[PDB]
Structure formats: C-alpha cells, structure tokens
Design a protein around this ligand. Structure first.
Ligand SMILES: Nc1ncnc2c1ncn2[C@@H]1O[C@H](COP(=O)(O)O)[C@@H](O)[C@H]1O
Ligand SMILES: Nc1ncnc2c1ncn2[C@@H]1O[C@H](COP(=O)(O)O)[C@@H](O)[C@H]1O
Ligand SMILES: Nc1ncnc2c1ncn2[C@@H]1O[C@H](COP(=O)(O)O)[C@@H](O)[C@H]1O
Ligand SMILES: Nc1ncnc2c1ncn2[C@@H]1O[C@H](COP(=O)(O)O)[C@@H](O)[C@H]1O
Lengths: 317, 317, 317, 317
C-alpha cells in the first residue's frame, strides 16, 4: 500500500471540491521537478564530451513551459526574468506562480545540493493580469514548497493543510510519500549563518551567536553547519531543528534573499511545520511587496530558537 | 576524443607495465561506486513502501564483495568493521584497501551530500595478510580518491601522476573525464570548520579564524562554509580553493577523523593537487599508524592558507 | 506542446465530468506499467547475481496492489489467479479490471517483447461484488489498452473517443503523447499467424493464406511476420496495417487466447482504431462470457483484410 | 562473485597475454552498446516533444567515434557507409571492425526488437589500410557478437573459446555474466523464415517447410516464429534451438543479408555455440569476400535441423 504524489494531489483536489485546475498545476510541477532532477544529475553529459561528435537557463525554460502548458497560470515570476511573465489568453488559468528554478546556480561547480523553490498565489484581481497579481503578502499563499536535488531528490509540499515530504524514486519516476504532516522540533541544536560576515553583523546576531557557542547556563554549544544553498540549509533546519539566519549585513537592511521566490515559500513551509519565520521585526509572510525581485532578511527555524533571538533583538532598541 | 574511467585506467596500466591486477582493482572500485550512487539516489524505494506487496551496511557489503571479486586484494579495512578483513586465499591479490563506505551516513535524512573514501596500499610484507599490512604511512599509497554523491556523482582519483575528476553519466553508467590533472589555487577564499566548538579551540586556530573575519589590513573576510560531510567540504576545497580544518578540540584531543580511511586519502589528494595537509604539527602522510581506526587532526587546503595557519601555530610554541 | 499521460487523463476526466475515480484508476495503471517496465528491463539484476552478497508473479502483484490502492476497483480478474480478486470493502470503487500482467511470459528467456493487456468495466449490479460482474461483453468496456515493453515502452489507451499512444521517457518517468487518435490502414500487406499448425487449419484459413502467398490478381505477395507475443503482433498490426490471426484448430477448438483479458481489450483497440475483430463467426466484442478464463478465436486488423477472410469463411458454409 | 563484462574481457586479455589493445577495443564496444541502448529506449524524448531548454545515424556515429577513440582500429565497415572508414593516422590500431549499427531500423516505428551486430578481424596485410583488410573470410574473425535491445538488453560475445551472454543492468550501466559457454540444442522445434516469399522459394526450402508442418513420421509439427529482425530471430534460435533461414529466392540468387556484418558475425556465434551456418552449398565462414557490401544466403541453427535441410539440398542437385 503506497501513496504517490499524483494520487495524493488528486485525493486532496477531490476532498476540496476543486475544479481540477490546481491539480493540473501541481501535476505539471511534479513533471518539471523530475526533468530538472535528471538534468542536475547530469544524465547525458557523455554527449557534450563527444561520445557521438546552461543548467539554470534550461531549468528556467522547463518550468515556464511545463506550467504554461498546464492551462492553469496567468502570471509567472522568475529569478532570471526581469519582468513578470504574462501567459497568453489561450493558456490562461487563474494561478500566479513565483519560483526560483535553480537555487544556488553558483554552487553546481562544487556539486553542492541545489534546489527549486515555488509559491502559488491565486489571482485575486479580475482585470487583465500583470505584476500586481504577484505582489501579494505570503500569508496569501495557497501552496508552496521546494525540491531539493542532493544525495537523493525530495519534494516538500506545504499547503493550508500541512507539510508532506515526498522522495523521488528515479527508477519509475514517482514521488513516494515518505514523511507526512511534518512538524519541526520546538528547539534544535544547530545554528546556520555565514560567519565570515561577522564584522558586518548587527548586535543582536552577535549576542545570539555568542550565546550559542558559549552558553551562559553552560549546557552544550550549538553545532554550526552552512552549506550555502538555501534549500539544503532550510531542509536540514526542518528535519533536524535549529535556526537558519540570512540577516542584514551591509547589503543594506534589504538582505540578500528575495521575498517572493525564496523567503516567502520557505517561511510558509516553516510556519505550517509549526516553526517561525521573521525579519527580526515583522513575520516574513506579512510584508506587502513593492517589487517582485525585492529582497528581505530572514531568520527561521525551531519555535524557541527563533523566539530567543527575537527577545535579543528587542533588547537593542 | 571522449575518455571514460575505463579507458583512462587501462591506458595508465599499459604505460606503467602493470600485470593488470591493479586495473582490475580500479575497475571493481568503479563498479562499486556506481552501485552505491544508485542506492544513495534511492532507486527502488517504492518497494520499501509496499508497491507490490541501513544504506551504509548495504554500502559496506557492496564495496567488500566487489573488491574481493577483483582477485586483487588481501586486507580491507573498513570504517564499519572493528577488525581488518583478511581475504579468502582463493581471491587473494597483493593490495590492501582502506575505505569509508559512506562518509557521514547521518547526512542521508537531511539529504546532505555523502561520499565514499578509499586508499590503496600495496602489501610490502612477505608475511601472511594481516592488520599490520594496513598500518603503513599514507606516504605509501599507490592510489587514493573519493566519490561524492552530490547534485551529481563525481569520483576524483589521485594517483602517482596526478588528480583527475570523472563525472558519472547515469544514463549509460560511465564516468567521463571532466577534469584533467587538477591543481588547487595557491590562495583560497573560504574557510571550513565547525565553529560551534569555538569554546574548545586552541589559540592558533582561534587566531586564524579571527584573522579571516577581521583581515589585518582592509581586506575582505573569507566566506565561511561547512557542509558537514568531509567529502563535500574537501571537494569544494579542491575545486574552489581555501582551507578545511578539523582540529583536535578537547572532546577528541587526537582529532575525530580517522587516519587510514578519511585523513590519508584526502591528504594524498590535496598533495597531488598541489595543496597541503597537516595536523598543525606534522605532515599527515608521514604519521606511522599504530591502530587501524586511529584518529588524526587535519588541516588541508591551498598552500598559502595552510601556511598562514602553520606560522600562527609556530608563533605559539 | 507536451502532453503527458497525467495531463491527458486529467483533462479527459474534466471533459467527461467524472468524479475523478476513473482518473485515479488510470493514474494507477500508469504507475503500474512503469514499475513493470523497470522490472522487465532488468534494473537491479546485479543484486540477484550477488553484487552485495519470477517476473510474471511480481507483475501480477504490482498490478493488484497498485489497483487496490486507487480505491477505484471492486473486482479484479488476472490471467494468473484462478478466481476473481474481490477488493476489500474499504477500498472498493465501481470498476472491474480484467488484465493480463505479462502477455507471453515464455518470451522472457528468448527476450522478445512482452506486454500488459487490460480492460475496464463499470460494475452496474447492486449485488455484493463477485466473479459475475466481470462476465460482461467487450462492448461494455469503459477503456482498454496495453503497454508494450519492446525496443521502447509504449502505452496505448482506447476509450470511446479514440486510440492514443504514449511513449515512455524512462529518463523522467513520464509517458508522452506521440500519436493522437490512431486509425489503422484500410488494407495492409502483412499477415500474422503461426503456420506450424497448418495441418490443423480450417479451409477458410487455408484458402486465405494461399491467396496471400500466391495472389489471385497479379499483386505482390504479403510479407509474413509472427513474433509470438500478442501485444507485439497486434501493435505491429495497429501501426503498420495488416491482419493478425489466432483461429481455432484440432488442439484448441475454442482458440488459445482468452476472451476477458487478451481478446476483448485488443478488439476494443482495433474497432476504435477503425479495424475489425472477429471469431470468424461473431464480432468478438458481443460474445457474452460464461467463464472468466474462457477462450475465443480472434482475427483482427485492417477492415479490408479481415473482410476478405470473412467472405472466404462465408463461401464455406 | 559476479563477473561484469569489464572484469571478463580484462581477465581473458590477461590470460591471452595481449598488449591491452583488444581489451581497449572490447571495452569501447561495450560503451557504444550502452549508449545505443539508452537512445533506443527513448530516454530524452520529452525534449523532442517540446519540454523546452535518424536513430540509425546516431547509432552509426556513436559506434564510429567510440571505436575511433580506443586507438585500436584502422578500417571500419558500416551498413550505413558506402565506403570503408579509414581511421586517421594517430588513432590507428590493428583491428578491422565490421558492424551493423542498428539491425532492422524499420522495426523502430513498430517497436520491435532491434540490435547491433559486430565482427572483429586483425589487419593482416602490411599496406596502408584499405577496404581490402575487411575482405577476409569469416573463419578469420578474432571475435564477433551482437547486442539485442529486446525486453532487456543483452550482449552476446563469441571468441575463440566460447559464446557468453551478458545481461545489461541499466541501473548501474554494467553488463553481468548470466550464461556462460553457451551451446545450442542439437535439434530445436521452431523454424524461422518469411513465408510470404513462398512463390519464390527453391524446392529444397519448399520441401523443408512442408516436412516441418506435416511431419512424415507423424511426430509434432514445428512451431513457426519470424520477428523480422535478424538479432531477435537468431538470438531466439541460440537460446531455444531451431533453425533460422533467409535463403536465395529472387533478391538475386544471393539473399538479402550481407556477409561481413550480418551473416559472418552470426554464423561465427552459431559455430562457437555448436550449431551450423551454411548458404545451402558452402559454410558461410569460408566465403572469401569480394565487395564489402556483399550479400549472402544463410541458414543457421541446431546441427540436426540444418543437416536435415542440407540432405534435401543434396537430394535436388
Ligand atoms: N489538488 C489540490 N489539493 C489541495 N487543494 C486543492 C486541490 N485542488 C484544488 N484545491 C482547492 O480548491 C481551490 C480551487 O481549485 P481549482 O478550482 O481547481 O482551481 C484551490 O485554490 C484550492 O484551495
Ligand atoms: N592502471 C594503473 N595506473 C597506475 N599505475 C598502475 C596501473 N596498474 C598498475 N600500475 C602500477 O604498477 C604496479 C603493479 O601493477 P600490477 O602488476 O597490476 O599489480 C602498481 O602498484 C602501480 O604502481
Ligand atoms: N480520465 C477520464 N478519461 C475519460 N473519461 C473519463 C475519465 N474519468 C471519468 N470518465 C468518464 O466519466 C464516468 C464517470 O467517472 P467517475 O465518476 O470517475 O467514475 C466514467 O465511467 C467515464 O466514462
Ligand atoms: N580481451 C581479450 N580476450 C580474448 N583474447 C584476447 C583479449 N585481448 C587479446 N587477446 C588475444 O591476443 C591477441 C593479441 O592481443 P592484442 O595485443 O591486445 O592486440 C588478440 O588478437 C586476441 O586473439
């Protein structure tokens, strides 16, 4: 007795009395994540090396094409694409999708785990679609999640109902349900941040990190891990607990990570996994975007760990 | 002309006038890594989840059996096996293999990169195969390398003449030569160590890290990265340049990484790469093993960066 | 624009305004065929050969567990199980599925093409499900088709609206629509029959074959082909045109092929594709079954070929 | 222990005491065969169907470029090439390879079994290489064999000492030894020929078939099978026993099949397997070639069945 993503998605579209438009959207997203996984594992490199005589771009076009053909999307927002992509009236459906096709293109050389991030907003506005229908607070996400292409490939889908983890079996190309209604730990034991920007940190970070390497109560210190690929670091934070920080160094208070297609999906997953996600001031999901490519700081993780750092931010006011 | 692992290892055996036994051993090694890689990528899990009705144990078993089958080995030293495995007299050859089947088996859940590490020695004794044949300085390695199962699968093989990186094309099951006689950068740009243990670091490590975050001139700090699996961190270090450190803290005054099957291969690879690998005190490859599961400290990376840490070491003697 | 079988099934479902029970069944057929294709192809035989220290049965068990897990079936008839499988109440749906898991099981050693054949009926009686709900004439089929595991794997599905062919891309585990709304050639140039039984043919089969080898008007003879796999031979007939015959004789006065799970599916594919299917006396599809393992004589293919044989049969009565 | 094709070719190379050049040839051939198998099974067709980002040709390109890259060949003759390919000076080795890259490419649309056939001669003349080095009788072949891309992929290799069969495990891309020192059944019970050419057969074939359908001792008739791909029909004949015939009829008094790359490799396999291969008059392997594209009649299979038919050819001279 086994549940595949295809079965699960359909079971949930039927329980929700959906017209089946979102189920086609999600089915297309499954197919594209498998085509991206195959290309990331380098199936076919023999042919470039002349056995018979770019990845982020190819991933981009695969996602845009497979979702345009689902007849379920009107507005798409991409990492690469400068402007929002408006789908032809012939293929329009009502969802808005914001995605990062290949998190950490800078990391493929060294074969670091890379991933795909996505958030689906339902178009709310009636009139002719545009950038505006994407500019919605993350609290308004219908579904979001990520595909991690690491040791194995995993899809994490979070919707209004919960977080569920699917493992790709590459022999038959099916995502099998492995972990269901995932909830993160209350407090973890690992902290993730790029410490080489230590000089540029704000004082609440400095204090937090010091408490984690030399606890005052004098328990154990927290282990550090920083892969430097946002899907790998957040995935480990979800599975194992802890806190992942990508705070405001002197790339202004904007932070580095983008709001619509990196911070917001991850935050929605955290919050459905019963964790927290914040700028340090506001919850990430409540920011109303000014721009699609807008950046935002983020700290996310196990409930207590995030709370502890918010209290320290509070003392430097 | 495309070069495949199988072609390269043959050509190299021809040039060295070897009787083929070693090429058999490398051939076998190749078949084992492809088998680990498929199992790691989770081909066939659907069966586990009842579609029709640990991995490290499986990995250990794969490596042991394929290697006994080359008729090229007599002693195998395994991470997972307390004592050295003495090969059956019928399948005995003159090589001694030390391997770590799955560098960091605990990184599977988190879907963090994992890897296999190996070192090959030639038995130099007349005496029957015994644990003693394994206790040879890493300066006696005939071949060493590793396979990283990351976003893609790559095997780096370091031999007498150099370091070449072969990527697996999983469609035809062939490793293609992608990088030929790799040389690591003089000076890197990233440092790698678990800073949670900052409570227990010796003053030289402490001074070096400080120097990377607050560079004594006006310089840009180094990026920090620590994935948490030796093969992923050492491979990013070989490819991108920088330094990787696992010093001895007090909870492991002799280090934590094992000398015969983690340290010496990685040290042999760095040295053939044109980088350095030390314990802070001596060179890793010159340490004479006493125990097959002996731990050693290791600092390895680009020559300049490793030398800054050594002058810092000597400055506190 | 790419149409995957997942997209296709789902769209057709929306237009037929089904409650999605059929789409779930049809999605489970698809997953079942992929798992069986991977097994036919010997992915993993190395493990049977000790790298780490019955296909028919297993395919039987993959079709039953996956069909049961769709909650869309109530009675299943297998070639392999002497009785109808009655789905347990909590998984019962409204469809009856008649299947042959691996047509031509004896072809696995010689390695010729084998396939999976299926037919779907709707249970329409209110009595507690029984073997009886499967005894419906082929004319009552909701959907029928096959999966051919040949040089490539292809799934052919036929429903009331036509026949469509899906090629498996094994690199992503998705079936792609390659031929849409297939019609068979009007007159073919290849006949298929096992001529070793020439001794036992009735005179109409004997006259038809003579007329194919020595054509009455001065045409070139027909080519001859007979693979020995019903799915391979009927698929060649569908795409290339011609006639496939497995009539009755001294042995097998009722024919060899079984009505519920080999004859009727292929006969529904042929009539939907514009070809004929006959016993020599009735159209196969109108034969009301008396037993689940009942046999029938079958002749199918291009309408002008099948007719020329029915005429010869009539001129011998 | 398992024996992979790579371990076998190497140990037989070590025993024959060769310079490693022919092992480099056989290893290269094994790599082109996997590359052809992946392409044939249509891995990657979604890209042709627009997911964003003639087989005959590619099979020919893969074989030529992979065989060139082993630096072990000097003349190659292909089904697809009008003239013998002379290898460039710096890649010249001493072997002559005659190959049929994709036996029966017309089976592709219909998805029927296809294969690749090869025979290897040693250049024996002293002149700068020419098609002349290919015009040697099949009795001079060093090695010959075929790969069949059927329900699974199998390579069959015949060398001085026997016929061995390797199944492709496509999960690891490794050929595993499954049946060693194959000998064919003395008498089989299947005959194989295209009987649509009955108005063209000579009287010995005509009588031969009559006797197989109407056995004069009233024993059982033989079963007929004809797939239409030489590799499938001939492989079935090796495995299950019987006779395969494609004689002269009117496609010249010389037959359809070609001597260097279809007839000689298969006849060689049959003789090392213990069967026979004749044209009706002489043995196929003693025909001295005149053109590289020369055709030949061929009859092959179980010794007793071929002899029976030779006695009928004798009764009509
Ligand atoms: N497959 C799905 N699983 C979860 N809920 C869904 C599913 N499909 C649709 N629903 C819900 O029903 C609403 C309408 O879906 P739809 O009419 O198909 O566009 C969606 O916006 C979802 O909230
Ligand atoms: N493929 C290979 N490439 C590198 N050196 C090898 C190769 N095969 C053998 N040799 C060298 O020759 C020595 C003996 O080879 P062997 O006779 O195969 O045991 C080895 O210990 C190596 O130093
Ligand atoms: N995926 C499908 N493609 C074609 N027709 C379908 C499909 N799903 C349902 N139907 C038709 O609609 C009827 C009701 O479907 P259902 O309620 O799912 O049992 C079925 O018996 C079919 O005749
Ligand atoms: N791998 C092989 N298995 C069978 N015999 C071989 C093998 N390699 C070489 N030999 C024999 O030795 C002869 C010369 O080998 P070579 O020097 O490699 O060209 C060949 O023509 C073969 O008859």
């Amino acid at each position: 007795n086994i549940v595949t993503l295809t079965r699960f998605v359909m079971e949930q579209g039927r329980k929700a009395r959906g017209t089946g438009e979102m189920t086609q959207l999600l089915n297309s997203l499954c197919t594209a994540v498998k085509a991206i996984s195959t290309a990331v594992r380098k199936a076919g490199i023999a042919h470039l090396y002349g056995i018979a005589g770019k990845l982020d771009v190819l991933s981009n076009d695969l996602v845009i094409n497979v979702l345009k053909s689902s007849f379920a999307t009107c507005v798409l927002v991409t990492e690469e694409d400068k402007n929002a992509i408006i789908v032809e009236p012939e293929k329009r459906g009502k969802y808005v999708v914001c995605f990062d096709p290949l998190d950490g293109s800078s990391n493929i050389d060294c074969l670091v785990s890379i991933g795909t991030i996505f958030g689906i907003y339902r178009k709310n506005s009636t009139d002719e679609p545009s950038e505006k229908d994407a500019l919605q607070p993350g609290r308004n996400l219908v579904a979001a999640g990520y595909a991690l292409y690491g040791s194995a490939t995993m899809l994490v889908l979070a919707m209004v109902n919960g977080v569920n983890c699917f493992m790709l079996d590459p022999a038959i190309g099916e995502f099998i349900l492995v972990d269901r209604n995932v909830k993160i730990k209350k407090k973890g034991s690992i902290y993730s941040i790029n410490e080489g920007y230590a000089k540029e940190f704000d004082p609440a970070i400095t204090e937090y990190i010091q408490r984690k390497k030399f606890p005052p109560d004098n328990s154990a210190p927290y282990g550090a891990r920083y892969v430097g690929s946002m899907v790998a670091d957040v995935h480990r934070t979800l599975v194992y607990g802890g806190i992942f920080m990508y705070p405001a160094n002197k790339k202004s208070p904007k932070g580095k990570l983008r709001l619509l297609y990196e911070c917001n999906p991850m935050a929605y997953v955290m919050e459905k996994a019963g964790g927290l996600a914040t700028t340090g001031k506001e919850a990430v999901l409540d920011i109303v975007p000014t721009d699609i490519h807008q950046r935002a700081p983020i700290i996310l993780g196990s409930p207590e760990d995030v709370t502890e750092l918010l209290e320290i931010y509070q003392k430097h006011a």
